[PDB]
Amino acid sequence: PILEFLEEWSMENLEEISPAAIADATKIFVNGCWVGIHKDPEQLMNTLRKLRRQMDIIVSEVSMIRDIREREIRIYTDAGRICRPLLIVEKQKLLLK
Amino acid sequence: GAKKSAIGQRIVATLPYIKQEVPIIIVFRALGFVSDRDILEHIIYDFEDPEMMEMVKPSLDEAFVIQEQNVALNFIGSRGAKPGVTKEKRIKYAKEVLQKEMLPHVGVSDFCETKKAYFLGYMVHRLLLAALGRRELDDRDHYGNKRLDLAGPLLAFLFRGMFKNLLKEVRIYAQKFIDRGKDFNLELAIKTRIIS
Amino acid sequence: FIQMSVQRIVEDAPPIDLQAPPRYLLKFEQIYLSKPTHWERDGAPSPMMPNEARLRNLTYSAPLYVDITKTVIKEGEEQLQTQHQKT
Amino acid sequence: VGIRFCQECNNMLYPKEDKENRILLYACRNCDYQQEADNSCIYVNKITHEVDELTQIIADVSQDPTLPRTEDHPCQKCGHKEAVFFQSHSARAEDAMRLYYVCTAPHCGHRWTE
Amino acid sequence: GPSSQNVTEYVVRVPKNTTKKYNIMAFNAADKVNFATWNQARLERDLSNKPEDQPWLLRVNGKSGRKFKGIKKGGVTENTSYYIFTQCPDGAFEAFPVHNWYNFTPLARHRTLTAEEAEEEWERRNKVLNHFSIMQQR
Amino acid sequence: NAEKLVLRIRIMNSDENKMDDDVFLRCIESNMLTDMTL
Amino acid sequence: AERGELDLTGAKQNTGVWLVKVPKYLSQQWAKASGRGEVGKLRIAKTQGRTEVSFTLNEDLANEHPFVLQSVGGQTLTVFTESSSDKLSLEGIVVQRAECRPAASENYMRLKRLQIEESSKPVRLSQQLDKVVT
């Protein structure tokens, strides 16, 4: 489901791109596999975060990591990842009311 | 050395089921990327960076002799754990090693060479950044680099080994009866004690 | 592991191909698990409670069954496909 | 510094000298191809390597919520008061305490160091 | 003028079947591929494996011209489809699904070192002199 | 006096008048950087 | 002129074609009938200094698809076809690339969820068995 959604959104597959485009774009990794590149990493993370929080396509235990400096988005779905629940804060306010 | 320190530091790859490592550029040659520009395009994504380009110069010189994909595959096959009797078989063995044994998570299909070249180039690209000091070395202790094998995954590890024995056992049992000329009973072929 | 990994492991196993020349194939498709059962001396199955396993030094194990489809070809333009349900 | 690739087989071009004219030529290997060199420098390495970090810095870092933000260093390019400051923290420097600032205004990835 | 605000709308047609299949041919930008000199070309399946499940070999202008090898895209478009719009006299766009995607790269032609020859150079791989001279001797 | 200190090096004239005229400088350059002791 | 010869006439005419990436549901609806000769209309609107591409789904087919263009200077693409009579030809050269996106955002995921569930039907899972097999 993650790969299908990523393909639907403005993510270019590795096969269907020229290497000259990889410089500016951010690499997209899913379970350590470089799926493709994306030209708007910030919007993608907002969309990816929104889906997980709504539990639409992305399950709760899926972790999305963006390395802003390295221009990489790492999505991990495998088992064995240790996680804990944290309250979401938006605009210096708790979403918990 | 006189020429050892002139070329600089070269990058090699330790692929599975190969006794000795191979030059990195050779692996790219085997994957189907012959020209230097095509190989470097998978390693250096910004040609305007002279620092990165120099780091790969010694690697290119090391694999300069090998200039064709078949030549590179033979070199990889020649160093295989089971060297082929003839040159043709060596190429087939090397192709199988890269097809399945090398970076299997990237893919195992016959047309996944391009994907494996990009990731292999990314592995080289990551190595260059560490060598150039642009990226900090990974921390083994960092706990996000760790995974916990719970009861399930641990049990799944055993089941495949025990299920392979079960499938091997039925193959052996059936082969005896098929060679004898008589059909075999499936219920009798299965050894239930293997999994239990 | 029980719901997914065991079934995936069985599904991902390659079909067993055997050649004599009659040819034989074995394909495992569906995996079934029964509740933890204990077989008495007479051979009568009965549900095994965890306390009974603890008291009688038994293993709390569930029987595992797999649907196996066998196809045989005898180079006589005939194919016989027999399935052993819950092996 | 410039790296040149052959126009025939897209392979590396290495420096070569022609005694007939005594002019640097970048000659392809295994391709009997030659090119007229113009840089005149074939190799250069900087041991000190005082490479500017601002070139390495990526403007996208301004979106990092873990970086500190200061209103006391307005952006020169656009005047935006807010800025995100950090240290290079990259090996080979041996002294990484100076702060590099990146403007937080969207579309203005101006980077500067005080 | 009209071009400053021109609006164009055309009908879309999807024929059920076509005698000729449609596939994408991709050339890298650095290749600088030019079709002006492509007087003649040959496209056929490879013979190295020795059919429908094998790579495609492209030859241009016989042996004299450049040779390209096409490889099927390993990544499948299970959730994606590709269509091509071609101008027609009737003025309605026509969309054809992409049966296959092929990536073509140029193949250099020259006296490439053979496998047997590479064995001798492996001895001097660590220590070699005048990289240019190695090709001259061959 | 110049803000930059420079030292131009060239191979002997007798040899000019066998390994390689270009690579040899790299071997010298790498050799002089580390092996040579000031 | 031979069997392996490629009819490069399309390249000579410099015919231009557009490469479009569309989702499966749009193509699936087309694949439903796939023989009526009509699936929709492609509308392109141009302004003084901006161009927009959009596609409208046929009313019968249903019982907005904005298009985003992409740069094609980074890679050169050509389209060729193989005739059933062993006569390969080059249709033309790609001059522009476009992608299709869904107008809706919330309820659109509902259709995707059904597809993910639908593609999950072949995903076999172990079944609990009330009575031990005898």
Ligand SMILES: [Zn+2]
């Ligand atoms: Zn060349």
Ligand SMILES: [Zn+2]
């Ligand atoms: Zn600013």
